[PDB]
Amino acid sequence: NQCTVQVRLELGHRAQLRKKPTTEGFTHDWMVFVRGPEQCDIQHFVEKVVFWLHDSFPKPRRVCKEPPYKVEESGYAGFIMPIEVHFKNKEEPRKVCFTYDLFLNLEGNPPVNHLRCEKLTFNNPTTEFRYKLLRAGGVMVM
Numbered sequence: 001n002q003c004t005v006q007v008r009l010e011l012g013h014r015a016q017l018r019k020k021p022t023t024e025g026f027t028h029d030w031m032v033f034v035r036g037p038e039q040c041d042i043q044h045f046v047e048k049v050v051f052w053l054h055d056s057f058p059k060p061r062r063v064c065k066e067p068p069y070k071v072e073e074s075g076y077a078g079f080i081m082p083i084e085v086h087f088k089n090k091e092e093p094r095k096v097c098f099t100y101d102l103f104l105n106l107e108g109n110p111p112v113n114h115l116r117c118e119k120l121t122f123n124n125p126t127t128e129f130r131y132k133l134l135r136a137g138g139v140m141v142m
């Protein structure tokens, strides 16, 4: 009476040099996201994604209750960004935290376009959460 369900999350970011006045201080535009692979719908099992920005940002706790799960910002430095993916789960685990390396392109390097692929293994999900994981394009491994 085991079942294991695997789902994939993609965390990623894009960064490039910003174009505004010498006197506006942000050197970069960036974008950070959480998504499913092609033809998966992670909204079936994801309640919300919380992006914890550097304390220097206004409202550093950025919440996406629905897709797209992303933050678009301007900034002057990279930082380590905690990213919490909350589940539509009534038991443990209720969420996963990732520590995301939000690094910028320095000294005339090309734009950054990074992806981090995370495989989540749910052991013995409740019947309802199992269904959500599968609706999202999750796979039974037993």
Ligand SMILES: Cc1ccc(C(=O)Nc2ccc3nc(CN4CCCCC4)[nH]c3c2)cc1I
Pocket: 026, 054, 056, 057, 058, 073, 074, 075, 076, 077, 078, 079
């Ligand atoms: C280690 C470190 C890393 C990043 C920052 C940073 O970029 N801070 C920062 C602080 C305030 C900001 N405000 C913006 C602009 N957004 C525009 C859209 C919503 C309002 C703020 N970008 C901002 C960026 C500061 C440090 I020291």
